[PDB]
Design a protein around this ligand. Structure first.
Ligand SMILES: NC(=O)c1ccc[n+]([C@@H]2O[C@H](COP(=O)([O-])OP(=O)(O)OC[C@H]3O[C@@H](n4cnc5c(N)ncnc54)[C@H](OP(=O)(O)O)[C@@H]3O)[C@@H](O)[C@H]2O)c1
Ligand SMILES: CCc1nc(N)nc(N)c1Cc1cc(/C=C/C(=O)N2N=Cc3ccccc3[C@@H]2C=C(C)C)c(OC)c(OC)c1
Length: 163
């Protein structure tokens, strides 16, 4: 009933490499935990295999065509259309295929911009700020543990109006 994208992508829109995050960034995991806590994560089968187990304290939903898929702690779905039946705040969690499928459908997007260029093999779909309003933009703090500049965006889809 309220559907969002949750993603971290670098300056070229890279989001993954060899089924892993290209970068080590603890604050963004804290970001993800705070945002989706008590809510619903919807993700594809490869993304789930990457994480390797349900995230606690929230509903984990996996989309796959495998009818044998039945993990403990994970609710499974078999079509995009199934996502609209999930109640509450749903976060499209990844990966590339689900982002491509969902980017025109979601209300808003919570994007962590990783301010670097990483080698990648999976990408977030292109988008333009002409379409998306910057609800907030906040620089992450850097320290010994979080050494890559990053920016937390909250983007809301702009309404189409006659001008
Ligand atoms: N930086 C970030 O914020 C971010 C977010 C999450 C993931 N990642 C990353 O994204 C990468 C992988 O992305 P990916 O696109 O290759 O895989 P993926 O999107 O995570 O999911 C792959 C799978 O989901 C399925 N699926 C997708 N649409 C479906 C539909 N309409 N009906 C039924 N099943 C459907 C299939 O499962 P089956 O083949 O089992 O049928 C499919 O092959 C990783 O390398 C990873 O680290 C990073
Ligand atoms: C972080 C990757 C990513 N980033 C963004 N912005 N959007 C996103 N949609 C994601 C998606 C994402 C995620 C993760 C990691 C999730 C995770 O490990 N947590 N998040 C929820 C959670 C809930 C309860 C307890 C612990 C956690 C834990 C956070 C810690 C404090 C350790 C991940 O594995 C490393 C991954 O690999 C492909 C992808």
């Amino acid at each position: 009933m309220t559907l969002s994208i949750l993603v971290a992508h670098d300056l070229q829109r890279v989001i993954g490499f060899e089924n892993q995050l290209p970068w080590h960034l603890p604050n963004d995991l804290k970001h993800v935990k705070k945002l989706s806590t008590g809510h619903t994560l919807v993700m594809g089968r490869k993304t789930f295999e990457s994480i390797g187990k349900p995230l606690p304290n929230r509903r984990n939903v996996v989309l796959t065509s495998d009818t044998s898929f039945n993990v403990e702690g994970v609710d499974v779905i078999h079509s995009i259309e199934d996502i609209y039946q999930l109640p509450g705040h749903v976060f499209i969690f990844g990966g590339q295929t689900l982002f491509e499928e969902m980017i025109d459908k979601v209300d808003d997007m919570y994007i962590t911009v990783i301010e670097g260029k990483f080698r990648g093999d999976t990408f977030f779909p292109p988008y333009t700020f002409e379409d998306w309003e910057v609800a907030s933009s906040v620089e992450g703090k850097l320290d010994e543990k979080n050494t890559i500049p990053h920016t937390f965006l909250h983007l809301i889809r702009k309404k189409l109006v006659p001008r």
